[PDB]
Amino acid sequence: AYECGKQGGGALCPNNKCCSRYGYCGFGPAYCGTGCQSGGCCPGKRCGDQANGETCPNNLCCSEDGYCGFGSEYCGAGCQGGPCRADKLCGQLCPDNLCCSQWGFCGLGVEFCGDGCQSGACCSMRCGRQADGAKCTNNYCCGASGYCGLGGDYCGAGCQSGPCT
């Protein structure tokens, strides 16, 4: 019956809905207040240096203060995680499975994850006996067909390397 959070297999709610302390999605104090697990918590969840390096759920920005939110106060000056307004360099894996482009910037979409993708959620990164025993980055699994990814198709039967089974 649970929807989200520790009760719901780590799932997030859609459209910034807060995950209550009991693992259901909604807005208002019962969801976003004390115990809020993810979404638009109020106050924002603690993050970055102020929470042992934990990133914000739902790709919220981690403020200079170490709270999760959106707006200039969170994503602008002093932003330490999430979709900060500053370009994010990599080479230092991108946080939260963002793709490190060939040019060493973090992002998502084909410009980052496609041709030349170094690491993160790359579209099509080869591995295993199909790619000279090449290893996957980010501790992903090498699927039977020699593609890097996560989930049953890559970590399940036929898995060549990484955290198989």
Ligand X SMILES: CC(=O)N[C@H]1[C@H]([C@H](O)[C@H](O)CO)O[C@@](O)(C(=O)O)C[C@@H]1O
Question: Which residues, numbered 18-37, are part of the site for a second copy (CB under 8 A)?
Answer: 18, 20, 24-33
Question: Does 163 sit near a second copy (CB under 8 A)?
Answer: no
d(CA 30, CA 49): 27
Question: Does 158 sit near a second copy (CB under 8 A)?
Answer: no
Q: Measured from the CB of residue 26, what is the shortest distance to ligand X in angstroms? A: 6
24 Cβ neighbours under 8 A, 6+ residues apart: 2, 3, 4, 31
Helix (H, G, I), strand (E, B) or coil at 13: coil
- Candidate residues 48, 66, 74, 160; the one interacting with a second copy per rule CB under 8 A: 74
Q: From residue 105, give the alpha-carbon distance in Å to each of 87, 98, 116, 133.
A: 7, 9, 12, 27
d(CA 63, CA 48): 8
For ligand X, which is the closer residue by CB, 53 or 152?
152
Q: Which does 49 bind (CB under 5 to 8 A by kind): ligand X, a second copy, none?
A: none
For ligand X, which is the closer residue by CB, 104 or 133?
104
For a second copy, which is the closer residue by CB, 92 or 124?
124
Q: Which does 149 bind (CB under 5 to 8 A by kind): a second copy, ligand X, none?
A: a second copy
Tokens of 146: 């020699």
For ligand X, which is the closer residue by CB, 86 or 133?
86
Tokens of 158: 């036929």
